[model samples]
Each structure stands twice: as structure tokens, then as C-alpha cells.
Target: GDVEKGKKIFVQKCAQCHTVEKGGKHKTGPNLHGLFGRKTGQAPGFTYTDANKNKGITWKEETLMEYLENPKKYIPGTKMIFAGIKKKTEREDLIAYLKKATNE
Candidate 1:
């Protein structure tokens, strides 16, 4: 249901830079695999800006929800290069998708 639509939305919006693969490498953004409880700005092997690395942020469902609403607002001066998702449905759907995919 929403998962499938969220997959499409991710492909269209975020796949260019961020990947969700289990063992994927960094592109413009870091892979989001197992991101549910991982630390932010610390996707293994990816270079994070000082602003990002210094924040010591962690990923949680609600935290990610806010981040997706406005990444720059959520973490000012960070290098997340997207404008953030605006659609409420897309955000919720994407969160659902991530809840499954980013858990392992």
C-alpha cells in the first residue's frame, strides 16, 4: 500500500543521491540502510561536514519525520543537499518504508 508508493517517491526524490541498499556506498549522500537507530552524519565511510559530525544526532522514527520535513531546519549548516519532502503523505509513507527497510 503506502510502502510501494513511498518506494516510488524515494526513487523519484532521493535515489539520485541517497541509496537504501544494505551494503551500498556513498553517492552525494550516504546510504540509509539500518538507519533506524544509527547516528546521523556518520554513515560508514561517508565524509560528513563538521557541522554534521559535531551535532551527534541519532535517528529515530519521530526524529526522522522532523528531519524529512526540513533537513536544514532540523540540522542547521549540515550538508544534506535536498530541500526536504513537503507532502505529508509522502513523508508518512516514506517513514513506513524506512521502518521496514532501514531496520536491517
Candidate 2:
């Protein structure tokens, strides 16, 4: 899937739980506003688990790709409840969409 396809995928799959748009309210998870390069658990008022905050990780394309593949397996005690995206292409599309949207 391309970036445009990724946007729809997220809207169908992730929009109910997160928001990448600025000034949006946190739904189930924190809004992924400007997610790239941000430290884990940095979303506004997000109650990050010790693993994510203390994770000391920065959100970049490569990291997010892996993380999105398996949030729970990647990190224990994460606040994310997502089962994870199993398809590599879908993950790539989502990351591309995020990169494009987050930059705006």
C-alpha cells in the first residue's frame, strides 16, 4: 500500500484510538502528534508505562516500523493494547503515512 492507502488504513484501523493531528484530544491512546523523533510516552498527559518512558527511545521510521509490528512483544508493560500489524507492507504503508502526516 502507498502512503495514501496507508492513511485510509489507519483511519479504518487506528483513528478510533489515536490522532496524529495537532491539538486533537487523546482517545484510547495519546494523539500521535508529531510522533517522529519524539521520545516514548511523550504524548500530552499520556500515562506511559515504565518501559516506554524509561525506554529512552526516540521515534523514528525504523523504530516505529518494528514497534508497530509488535508493540507488546517489542516492549513489556506498554500502554498499547494493539495486537499489532502482521503484514510488512501494511506496516510500511502506515509508517509512510505517519511520516508524511506528522511532518505537516
Candidate 3:
């Protein structure tokens, strides 16, 4: 799954605002540990956009893929400042690493 590569990418790009360890505190964004299989808009202490809160979505792989492709498109008004990963492989690797890191 190229998890190590994903870890490197995440450290360089995502670690500043997100955490992937259990009980990790929220930063600019929510902690992403245990994100897979979780209901959307459920991260603790993090406010969600109204669109997301009303959508009743889940964080499945496909949903994650779409969201990663264009976060604002999927969930308008989200606070994530990331412009979205442009490469499909990079997104896949990031998801793979997140799955392992969060153990979900």
C-alpha cells in the first residue's frame, strides 16, 4: 500500500493540522485517527459544514476518494484549506497509510 511513502507525504502536508493517533487532539482540523468507517461530520469538537451535517454520509473509500478529489465540492463550507491531491496514486497511498495508522 506504500504506507511509508504515504506517511512521508502526510508528514510533509497533513501533520500540521491533523493527527492520526488515538485520542490525538484537534488542530486546525480534526484528529483523523479512526476516521475510516466513521460517520461523516462526527469528529469531536470540530464544527462541520451544514451541508455535511445534513447529508448523513459515511467515510467509505469511494466517498473519501471523491472528497479528496475536491473537498469543497463534496462538502461545501468545510474549513480544510487543502487544495486536494491531484494524483490518484497519492490519494490512494494516503488513504492506505491512514487506514494503517488509524487501525480502522
Candidate 4:
């Protein structure tokens, strides 16, 4: 549940493209600051796939968890390039880290 560990995972797997700070610029992906409680496919300046843009989803813990487990299954056409988390513990830890990062 430590956010530091989540930061590690993020750096290891996601930092190459995404950033979690507010007002952060887009790399290969959108900035993730304040991702909690946000509507899906709404990160400004980042192009969302049609499947995600049509869903109008809110990024709650449950929704994020489900999506993080299987992005293609969750949104069908999300542009996120990484594969979904395969381990439950890793997913839980990442969720905890994201919650902490976003203060959700």
C-alpha cells in the first residue's frame, strides 16, 4: 500500500510515457495527475480512441481496477500501449499507489 512502491512500478513500467503530476505534459501518453474521479478519455490534449470517448466513464477505484486488469476488455479500443497488469497484488498495489498519488 505504500505509494513509494507504486512510484517504483510506475517508473519501471509507465514513466517512459506517462506523468502523474498536475499540468504535466504528455509524453507518449497523457499526464495522470488527478486521474481519480476524472471522466475517462478526457485528459486534455491527449487523443482518446473512439471506444473510450464514447463511454463517458468516471475513474473510480473499481472502474480503474477493472480497466487496469484488462484495458482492451474494459474499453475495447483504448490507446494505452501497455498490457494490463496480470498479478492481483501488483494491481492492488498500483491502485493504492494511484489513489495516493491522486489523493482519492
Candidate 5:
């Protein structure tokens, strides 16, 4: 749950595709503002595949914990192509950072 470590992880692993600031632009992936409490595939101006749209997931720490562990396993057919974070602590750190960063 270390925010700095989380940010480092995100910069290395996620920055190419995502932006965490409020009203940030959608990159290869959707912008992550309001993501914790938001529904899957609901970001305006971003197009999500049916796999995400139909899943109807509500994002939160718990849900993100599971999903980040194995996105393909959590939601089969999701477009996200990176392999999951294998370390539990790393995921926690990332989620902790996300809670603060995405909400701002």
C-alpha cells in the first residue's frame, strides 16, 4: 500500500496505456478518473468492447484487487493484454495509489 511504489509500478507498467488524472485523455486504454466507484466500460468518449461493457462490474479496491491479479481470468476476453501483477503487495500498492490518484 505504499503510494510511491505504486506510482513507480504504474509508470513502468501502465503509463503507456492509461492516464489517472481527472478528465485525463484516453490513451490506448481508457482514462481512469472516478474508476474506483465507477462501472466497467462506462467512461464517456471511450469505446469498450462487449466483454467489458457486458460484465457490469463495479470497480473498487476488492474488485480491482482480483482483476489486477489476473485480468484475463477475472474477465475473459477483455482487451487488456498485459500479464497480471504476480505480487500481492505490488497490487495493493497500485490500488492504494489509484484510490488517491484517480479520484483527484
Candidate 6:
């Protein structure tokens, strides 16, 4: 996946609500740093809907692919309002970017 393209996608689609930088502020959505391998709804002080809090799923590349394809389907009562990413390549690219960005 192309990380550059993925950054564009994130800025266009996800930046309004999410921040991937370490210790970044939470917005409409929680900051996404350290997202991989974390349990759902576990970001420090962000309030999460019960659906996400109780989902009990871990985040990883495989799970993220499925979740990004359709967030509501992945967590039936999730609060995220973005429609799912429909393109596999786009999802892959986004994941690649997240792998680097969220860790830093």
C-alpha cells in the first residue's frame, strides 16, 4: 500500500475527527495513536458508546481491514459516522499509513 496516498485519504476523510499523532487531542473521534492491538473503546478519556466499549475486539491489520470496510457492521452500535471504505487498496493504504503514524 502507498503510505503517501493513504495520508491524503486520511486528511481528506479522517482528519476532521481523528488525530494519529502521539498524545494528540481527541476531537469528534478519539486520537488514534497506539490504535493497533488495543481493545475497542479504550482510548484514555474519550467516552465511547456501549457498543464499542463492549465489543471486546482487538485492533490489528486484519481486523482493521474488516472494520474499515464497514464500521457499523463490525461494531453494530458504534458511534463513528463515516461510511465504510469500499476499496480494498484504499484500506490497505490507510492501514500502512496508520502502522507508521499511530506508532509515532
**Collision count for each candidate, in order:** 0, 0, 0, 0, 0, 0
TM-score per candidate: 0.89, 0.91, 0.90, 0.88, 0.96, 0.97
**On a 0 to 100 scale, what is the lDDT of residue 34 in model 3?**
78
Q: Give the per-residue lDDT of model 3 (tens digit) for 1-104.
A: 58988899899889999988888988888888778888887878888777767667788778888898888888887778788888899888888888898864
- Highest TM-score model number: 6
Give me the runs in candidate 2 sitting further than 4 Å from their true place: none
Q: Which candidate model has the greater TM-score, 2 or 3?
A: 2
Model 3 ranges off by over 4 Å:
none
For candidate 6, lDDT tens digit of each residue in 1-104?
99999999899999999999989999999999999999999999899999999999899999999999999998998889989899999999999999889998
Q: Give lDDT for model 4.
A: 0.80
**What local lDDT does model 2 show for residue 13?**
87
Q: What lDDT score is found at residue 88 in candidate 4?
A: 75
lDDT (Cα atoms) of all candidates against the true structure? 0.82, 0.85, 0.83, 0.80, 0.92, 0.94
Candidate 4 TM-score, true structure as reference: 0.88
Ranked by lDDT from best down, the candidates are: 6, 5, 2, 3, 1, 4
Clashing pairs in 5: none
Better by lDDT, candidate 2 or 1: 2
> Considering TM-score, where higher is better, how would the candidates rank from best to worst?
6, 5, 2, 3, 1, 4
What RMSD does model 4 have?
Answer: 1.8
- Give the TM-score comparing model 5 with the true structure, all chains together: 0.96
The superposed Cα distance between candidate 2 and the true structure at residue 33, in angstroms, equals: 1.0
What lDDT score goes with residue 70 in model 2? Answer: 91
> Evaluated with lDDT, which candidate comes out highest?
6
Q: List the residue pairs that clash in candidate 2.
A: none
